[PDB]
Design a binder for this molecule. Sequence first.
Ligand SMILES: O=S(=O)(O)OC[C@H]1O[C@@](COS(=O)(=O)O)(O[C@H]2O[C@H](COS(=O)(=O)O)[C@@H](OS(=O)(=O)O)[C@H](OS(=O)(=O)O)[C@H]2OS(=O)(=O)O)[C@@H](OS(=O)(=O)O)[C@@H]1OS(=O)(=O)O
Ligand SMILES: O=S(=O)(O)OC[C@H]1O[C@@](COS(=O)(=O)O)(O[C@H]2O[C@H](COS(=O)(=O)O)[C@@H](OS(=O)(=O)O)[C@H](OS(=O)(=O)O)[C@H]2OS(=O)(=O)O)[C@@H](OS(=O)(=O)O)[C@@H]1OS(=O)(=O)O
Lengths: 101, 101, 200, 200
Amino acid sequence: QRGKNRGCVLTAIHLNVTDLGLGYETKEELIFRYCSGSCDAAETTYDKILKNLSRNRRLVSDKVGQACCRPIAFDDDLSFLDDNLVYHILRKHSAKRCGCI
Amino acid sequence: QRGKNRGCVLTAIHLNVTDLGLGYETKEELIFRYCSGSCDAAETTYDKILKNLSRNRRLVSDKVGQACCRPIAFDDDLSFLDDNLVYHILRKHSAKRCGCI
Amino acid sequence: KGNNCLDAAKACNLDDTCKKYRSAYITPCTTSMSNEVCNRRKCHKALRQFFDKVPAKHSYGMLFCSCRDIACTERRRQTIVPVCSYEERERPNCLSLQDSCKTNYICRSRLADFFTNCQPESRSVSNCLKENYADCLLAYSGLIGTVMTPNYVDSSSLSVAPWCDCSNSGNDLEDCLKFLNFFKDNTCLKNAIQAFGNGS
Amino acid sequence: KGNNCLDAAKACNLDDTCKKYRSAYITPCTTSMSNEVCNRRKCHKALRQFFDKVPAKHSYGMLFCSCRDIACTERRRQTIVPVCSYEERERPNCLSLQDSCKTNYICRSRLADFFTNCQPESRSVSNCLKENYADCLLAYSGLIGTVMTPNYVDSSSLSVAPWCDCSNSGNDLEDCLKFLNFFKDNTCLKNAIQAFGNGS
Ligand SMILES: O=S(=O)(O)OC[C@H]1O[C@@](COS(=O)(=O)O)(O[C@H]2O[C@H](COS(=O)(=O)O)[C@@H](OS(=O)(=O)O)[C@H](OS(=O)(=O)O)[C@H]2OS(=O)(=O)O)[C@@H](OS(=O)(=O)O)[C@@H]1OS(=O)(=O)O
Ligand SMILES: O=S(=O)(O)OC[C@H]1O[C@@](COS(=O)(=O)O)(O[C@H]2O[C@H](COS(=O)(=O)O)[C@@H](OS(=O)(=O)O)[C@H](OS(=O)(=O)O)[C@H]2OS(=O)(=O)O)[C@@H](OS(=O)(=O)O)[C@@H]1OS(=O)(=O)O
């Protein structure tokens, strides 16, 4: 009501492109942003069912099949020139908005 | 290659509609199906970055912001007649296919 | 205990086909419009598709289940969603309703199958001229979703009628009553429904 | 150490606007077509949008950064993706190229601003007739993405030229050379670029 799962949030870190381990050889840099935090509160019918079945013990377990904090939108493409003067473009590499899915 | 995250799977359970805790009063029944299992293997650029940053310690932590095993398609609508002879329809309540997202 | 109609609802919801086509008709049949309880045409359509597309063992289980109490017979009476698909503010005359039916290919055809296949003969063991409960049930369920949509009327029996009566028939009253009573007092149909409910 | 061109790439990728419009031009400028290295029109378009839409402090940082070594000057030379946007199999004559430029509203306008704003005057302190480095840099960067797209030629200097020469000029050779050398040997432009690289 005041927003379920407020703890699912965006975090930004400053990185060399080489830190990503994606195969690139370059001195260029980026801001990489990721989504983390809890998704304990149920925001869908399916998620309500899972939570209710743990509560009433029809699911002998807790937190099974739970939603998680994930990107629901991505930052714009990032490009860079590598050591051999070849250009590359990174796509869908960094989060713009987070949500439980 | 032979399929990353093979352990993310569909499981079916036989339930009374009342077990769902969705507010209904009825003697009717359903098959409810849910998605569970691990998503440790990275299937996207974003997920590769997260995994690589834990590996090289630029993310002081493990398994942060990880993908999870979730429905990527839902079963057909389920309807039932309640105790007061009122009809209802459940939508997007049960999983048809699972994936890491 | 519970009842045979609940069991048939259970079987249906546990079958991929029955479950889907049940929801496919419950939806338009319970979705009200501006100034109307439902869209009768769309509800009728989905009802026809239910009986045409879902195997008889499932679709008949819900329509023709046998009952011992009013909780069962009331569930059975709701199968076709009568508030939408059956009832109307006024009852037309059954001979007018027959005329409307006959201008429609599906209705004309299903109506003829009904009168042909559910013809009672008192001298037969089955009590049916055509001696085939399957074809009578097929013909009867076949009317559901036509203007001739029939339903249980009398909660203490298997008596059915379409939504019409024989008021203001002029000289055609005897013909009207013959038509109406072919639904209401039909030993062939009643035996055929009893037979399905037994487990033949 | 690293270099000023790397620093400008860093600043750009850390700015929402510069980052987006850089990728927006790197994409079409490095996407090859069937039988061609790129779509030159789409690359040109995105280059124009880069300089028009991205504030000068970012867009100029990459184009006009000062260098001490060949690793820096080679990075700077690649800023406009010259394999796509600049080079062609053959060099046309600069007077023909000027004609083509003049039939296009943007090219005609940017070309005139260039000759107006980067006019060298040897008697001035700035060495510019119009005495305004900002307007000269604006005019020069403005040509990028037109048929008159200029780029660094001489890796040991700030010398620039469009993609044309003065071969086969007939009687117009002196006019041709005047046009070409206005890019190649331009003290106003060179001072203006040096000035930006210093940090004015
Ligand atoms: O083939 S039949 O002549 O036996 O007719 C049944 C098939 O036609 C459909 C096609 O519908 S669709 O799959 O949604 O495209 O229905 C269409 O024809 C019927 C009968 O018309 S007719 O003139 O008597 O032959 C119309 O019903 S009704 O007006 O007579 O009550 C349908 O109208 S409506 O949509 O219900 O208003 C008409 O649909 S449509 O305009 O073409 O969309 C299907 O019958 S139906 O689902 O009971 O309506 C049958 O197709 S199927 O592939 O066999 O399932
Ligand atoms: O307003 S201006 O006359 O100064 O021209 C610049 C604006 O027109 C655009 C619109 O493009 S869009 O935003 O993608 O819709 O470009 C269009 O006009 C230019 C110049 O034409 S003109 O006859 O000289 O005035 C064309 O470029 S060019 O052929 O002269 O090199 C564009 O052609 S092309 O797409 O590059 O092939 C033409 O685009 S379009 O056909 O309308 O799509 C934008 O200029 S541009 O991005 O440099 O091309 C300018 O719009 S803006 O809103 O100011 O950014």
